[PDB]
Write an enzyme that holds these catalytic residues in place. Structure first.
Site, PDB file in Angstrom:
ATOM      1  N   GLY A 175     -23.531 -14.564 -22.811  1.00 56.55           N
ATOM      2  CA  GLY A 175     -24.092 -13.432 -22.545  1.00 56.55           C
ATOM      3  C   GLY A 175     -24.276 -12.613 -23.883  1.00 56.55           C
ATOM      4  N   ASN A 227     -15.655 -24.855 -12.456  1.00 53.35           N
ATOM      5  CA  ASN A 227     -14.949 -23.583 -12.095  1.00 53.35           C
ATOM      6  C   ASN A 227     -16.094 -22.844 -11.140  1.00 53.35           C
ATOM      7  OD1 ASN A 227     -13.905 -21.221 -12.028  1.00 53.35           O
ATOM      8  ND2 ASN A 227     -14.079 -20.712 -14.009  1.00 53.35           N
ATOM      9  N   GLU A 257     -12.458 -14.376 -18.995  1.00 53.45           N
ATOM     10  CA  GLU A 257     -12.621 -13.449 -18.043  1.00 53.45           C
ATOM     11  C   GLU A 257     -11.432 -12.954 -17.671  1.00 53.45           C
ATOM     12  OE1 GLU A 257     -15.009 -15.553 -14.952  1.00 53.45           O
ATOM     13  OE2 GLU A 257     -16.500 -15.768 -16.719  1.00 53.45           O
ATOM     14  N   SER A 272     -21.758 -23.190 -22.568  1.00 59.31           N
ATOM     15  CA  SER A 272     -22.781 -23.356 -21.433  1.00 59.31           C
ATOM     16  C   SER A 272     -23.267 -24.482 -21.651  1.00 59.31           C
ATOM     17  CB  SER A 272     -23.990 -22.409 -21.803  1.00 59.31           C
ATOM     18  OG  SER A 272     -25.162 -22.803 -21.420  1.00 59.31           O
ATOM     19  N   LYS A 303     -15.630 -19.838 -10.153  1.00 60.78           N
ATOM     20  CA  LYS A 303     -15.574 -18.215 -10.163  1.00 60.78           C
ATOM     21  C   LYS A 303     -15.572 -17.726  -8.792  1.00 60.78           C
ATOM     22  CE  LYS A 303     -17.244 -18.574 -14.983  1.00 60.78           C
ATOM     23  NZ  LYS A 303     -18.280 -18.143 -15.750  1.00 60.78           N
ATOM     24  N   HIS A 345      -8.233 -18.121 -19.096  1.00 62.61           N
ATOM     25  CA  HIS A 345      -9.385 -17.956 -18.905  1.00 62.61           C
ATOM     26  C   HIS A 345     -10.108 -16.704 -19.572  1.00 62.61           C
ATOM     27  CE1 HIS A 345     -13.833 -17.650 -17.358  1.00 62.61           C
ATOM     28  NE2 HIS A 345     -13.891 -19.067 -17.316  1.00 62.61           N
ATOM     29  N   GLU A 354     -13.443 -22.052 -25.197  1.00 63.30           N
ATOM     30  CA  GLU A 354     -14.530 -21.196 -24.781  1.00 63.30           C
ATOM     31  C   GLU A 354     -15.044 -20.351 -26.122  1.00 63.30           C
ATOM     32  OE1 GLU A 354     -12.122 -18.999 -21.723  1.00 63.30           O
ATOM     33  OE2 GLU A 354     -14.020 -19.332 -20.465  1.00 63.30           O
TER      34      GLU A 354
END
Lengths: 246, 247
Positions: free
Chosen positions: A169, A9, A95, A209, A11, A93, A163
């Site tokens: 983060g 991906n 996001e 990750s 992005k 996703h 995910e």
């Protein structure tokens, strides 16, 4: 057995120049026999990507809407994606869920429309940190998949991506065991809520990750069938990840 | 130095490579009047394709973009990406993004500042919905919207304002030319007293309501209407007539 699946991906990254170089690198790489490779370029570049990429690698869109044409400026339809030579779309996703606030109902409607149009779907799920710390991972992921499952007719063109949003983060890395525990419960859910055949043949990929350094240990987990790669998709590290299962 | 007539065609989420190539061949043949600026906005998948086939006399716009140059926003595109494909405009704050996808004023403003800082032209859309017009508060709404946009514009020479009478789209409630005029005039008046005289006299305010080959002439004759943002008519040859509306 299940074909190993590796999605990259991109992005919101790249221009025509540095992506053409990335494409030349991938075109040179030798793709293992039992490995399926997919790239997802920014929407502006779907067309450009398919023309330069070897037919051995698939192109996916990063999103789409839920009807074939209409008054939705800034959106694109599955029919438009097919039209550019792409065969997959990434739906749901993290996001889109947590940055742009796309709802479960909306993701499901997108799933049913993209499948009805002949596209493959990579359908993303996963829990946020507040929810993991409360002990409700299971409830949150199952509820997500029920909404997807309720809209899938034919599971052969569907890939599930887990995910671990709680470990992106956050300063909180997930262990391979922790991935494995969630993949196993998801496969178990498919077994008892859909069927045995669907559970045994559906690929569940890890979208946490992953680096050239971590990929080998994660790919040796029994219920991990491949990867949805974020930042590493743009470096030559990606070629190592494609070879993770050897 | 009067304001150049501005005609934008918003294709929205319509078309494939085949029927858009034909639409492009039609536009390529059309003669564009001396004092007219023509812009087309293809679905995002086709920005590249559109720029390659379209005559350099016509500009290409994106239908939307995000507010930083690169990053972890899957499904988004940046002004840098738009520039990279040979486009020079972006449509920001369209009614569909505001009301269907719920993009906020704060977000639209941030997008406006970023797109301008990156060298793009901006078509910035505003307008009130029906519930709000019936309450009598058109002025309050459009004003408050334009203010957020103005607060983020440094250089007005690359900005176009589009008024969308949302209250008259799929309502069964057409707007009269006079009703358009009355809103364009107040907006220009707002620019005059909140920015400057020069900005008010030189900024183009285009009408993004329902326009056909049949209605365009009377609307283009209004003193404060500087052109159009066209919806559905952008996909038919009717668009060529609209380009010539001031003739």
């Amino acid at each position: 057995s299940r074909k190993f699946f590796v999605g990259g991906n991109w992005k919101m990254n790249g221009r025509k120049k540095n992506l053409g170089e990335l494409i030349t690198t991938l075109n040179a790489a030798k793709v293992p026999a039992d490995t399926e490779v997919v790239c997802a370029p920014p929407t502006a570049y779907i067309d450009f990507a398919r023309q330069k990429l070897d037919p051995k690698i698939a192109v996916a869109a990063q999103n789409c809407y839920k009807v074939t044409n209409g008054a939705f400026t800034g959106e694109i339809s599955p029919g438009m994606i097919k039209d550019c030579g792409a065969t997959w779309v990434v739906l749901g996703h993290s996001e889109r869920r947590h940055v742009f606030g796309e709802s479960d109902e909306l993701i499901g409607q997108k799933v049913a429309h993209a499948l009805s149009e002949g596209l493959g779907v990579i359908a993303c799920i996963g829990e946020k940190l507040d929810e993991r710390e409360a002990g409700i991972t299971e409830k949150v992921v199952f509820e997500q998949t029920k909404v997807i499952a309720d809209n899938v007719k034919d599971w052969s063109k569907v890939v599930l991506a887990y995910e671990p949003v709680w470990a992106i983060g956050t300063g909180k890395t997930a262990t391979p065991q922790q991935a494995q525990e969630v993949h196993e419960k998801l496969r178990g859910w498919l077994k008892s809520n859909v069927s045995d055949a669907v559970a045994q043949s559906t690929r569940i990929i890890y979208g946490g990750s992953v680096t050239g350094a971590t990929c080998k240990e994660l790919a040796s987990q029994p219920d991990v069938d491949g990867f949805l790669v974020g930042g590493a998709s743009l470096k030559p590290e990606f070629v190592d990840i494609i070879n993770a299962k050897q």
